[PDB]
Each structure stands twice: as structure tokens, then as C-alpha cells.
């Protein structure tokens, strides 16, 4: 349940919540996000998130 933060905009990916609108059910770890998933608030890539 390790949270990751977007270093572009500050959105925090929370595995307990997932990201339903992008096809990511609650409980999905950051490491298991789809290869094309991007920050839902700003569009930044996963390579620009850091552990938070």
C-alpha cells in the first residue's frame, strides 16, 4: 500500500483507492499500473513519480 507522488503536480497514487476511471481497481499497487497509465491530474509519466 506504498503511496507514490507525482513530482509534476503533487497527486498521490493511493493503492487502497486505485484509479477506477482509468481501469485500476482498488488495491492495485503502483508497480502494477498499466504501462500507459499517466498521472490523472496532470498527464505526467510514471517515471516522474517518487515514493511518498
CB-neighbour burial class of residue 25 (10 A; exposed 0-12, middle 13-18, buried 19+): exposed
| Contact pick of 3, 5, 11, 17 for Fe ion (by CB under 5 A) | 11
Does residue 44 interact with Fe ion by CB under 5 A? yes
Choose, by CB under 5 A, the member of 9, 26, 29, 34 that binds Fe ion: 9
Instruction: Give the three-state DSSP class for 31.
Output: helix
CA angle 31, 9, 21 (to 5 degrees): 55
In the complex, the residues that contact Fe ion under the rule CB under 5 A are: 6, 8-9, 11, 39, 41-42, 44
Annotated binding site for Fe cation: 6, 9, 39, 42
Amino acid at each position: 500500500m506504498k503511496k507514490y507522488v507525482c513530482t509534476v503536480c503533487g497527486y498521490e497514487y493511493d493503492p487502497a483507492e486505485g484509479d477506477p476511471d482509468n481501469g485500476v481497481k482498488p488495491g492495485t499497487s503502483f508497480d502494477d499500473l498499466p504501462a500507459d497509465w499517466v498521472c490523472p491530474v496532470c498527464g505526467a509519466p510514471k517515471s516522474e513519480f517518487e515514493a511518498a
